[PDB]
Design a protein around this ligand. Sequence first.
Ligand SMILES: CCCO[C@@H]1O[C@H](CO)[C@@H](O[C@@H]2O[C@H](CO)[C@H](O)[C@H](OCc3cn(CC(=O)c4cccc(O)c4)nn3)[C@H]2O)[C@H](O)[C@H]1NC(C)=O
Ligand SMILES: CCCO[C@@H]1O[C@H](CO)[C@@H](O[C@@H]2O[C@H](CO)[C@H](O)[C@H](OCc3cn(CC(=O)c4cccc(O)c4)nn3)[C@H]2O)[C@H](O)[C@H]1NC(C)=O
Lengths: 133, 133
Amino acid sequence: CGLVASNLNLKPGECLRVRGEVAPDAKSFVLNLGKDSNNLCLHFNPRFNAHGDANTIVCNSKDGGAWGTEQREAVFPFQPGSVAEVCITFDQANLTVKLPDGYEFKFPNRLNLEAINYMAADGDFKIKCVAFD
Amino acid sequence: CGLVASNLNLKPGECLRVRGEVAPDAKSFVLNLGKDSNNLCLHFNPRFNAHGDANTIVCNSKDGGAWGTEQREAVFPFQPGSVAEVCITFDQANLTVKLPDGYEFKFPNRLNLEAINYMAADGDFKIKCVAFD
Ligand SMILES: CCCO[C@@H]1O[C@H](CO)[C@@H](O[C@@H]2O[C@H](CO)[C@H](O)[C@H](OCc3cn(CC(=O)c4cccc(O)c4)nn3)[C@H]2O)[C@H](O)[C@H]1NC(C)=O
Ligand SMILES: CCCO[C@@H]1O[C@H](CO)[C@@H](O[C@@H]2O[C@H](CO)[C@H](O)[C@H](OCc3cn(CC(=O)c4cccc(O)c4)nn3)[C@H]2O)[C@H](O)[C@H]1NC(C)=O
């Protein structure tokens, strides 16, 4: 288990930036954002090779412990053995996730949070920097 | 409170860098580092005007919930309403705290910690970036 941060108080429009090292033999990594471990407005899960999936970004939510409906994106701007930065903001409608190689997508905001207060990292990604604009 | 982070996995010799905003009306701010909230190898508390002190850094430890003996530093390179970076490293014997304007001091590692896994901020200091080298 990686870094866990709480009391983030990230408000709408504000940008969370996370930079880390993807392991040379990375299979999967996770960035979870929300209120706490049972309440995630974003589970962000790039799979290099995990759960039968190759080079696929899997996203979901978790509401009161229940996983929501999974969604997949169609670009994979991550390499094993490289540094990667991810930038995330939100409003009441969507989270906007900005990634390397110019790519960006929205994920619906399915929870009712006033602020994002919790972040947790897991898997094959070593956090080097977190910034809270 | 302010930001709380766990699973930091900071090891001897590694540098934890914290940048933030000292409030315009600052009286006091705190960075706590250790194993968890009850086991702090460093309670770092710059006091502009608080708890009987003026322009003094107070340091302490907390061991199993019990506060140690306070140490007061000789330097105070902070001002209200400014940005500040603090860099912390540690080893067997001491924490080394590097402050703005080239100041630094040592505080004994009273718990003999071999890893720092917990950090928390409180008071008139808003964390904007946390980095690991
Ligand atoms: C809809 C049902 C379809 O079948 C599958 O069902 C699976 C089980 O529910 C589903 O996987 C789960 O998807 C969730 C998101 O929708 C989560 O990604 C579930 O994992 C949660 C998790 C695991 N971990 C630890 C981790 O990622 C990790 C831990 C250590 C090392 C490492 O490289 C990674 N953290 N969070 C993950 O197990 C698969 O994504 C899903 N596949 C499809 C195509 O939908
Ligand atoms: C004046 C005669 C009594 O002596 C005092 O006794 C005090 C109580 O023991 C002692 O203070 C405590 O020292 C501890 C370290 O030895 C801690 O600093 C105690 O505070 C814990 C604390 C508080 N906070 C929240 C905080 O920093 C904050 C929160 C909101 C606004 C703000 O400006 C600041 N975080 N941690 C702090 O209350 C003071 O250091 C001590 N002072 C002297 C000069 O001896």
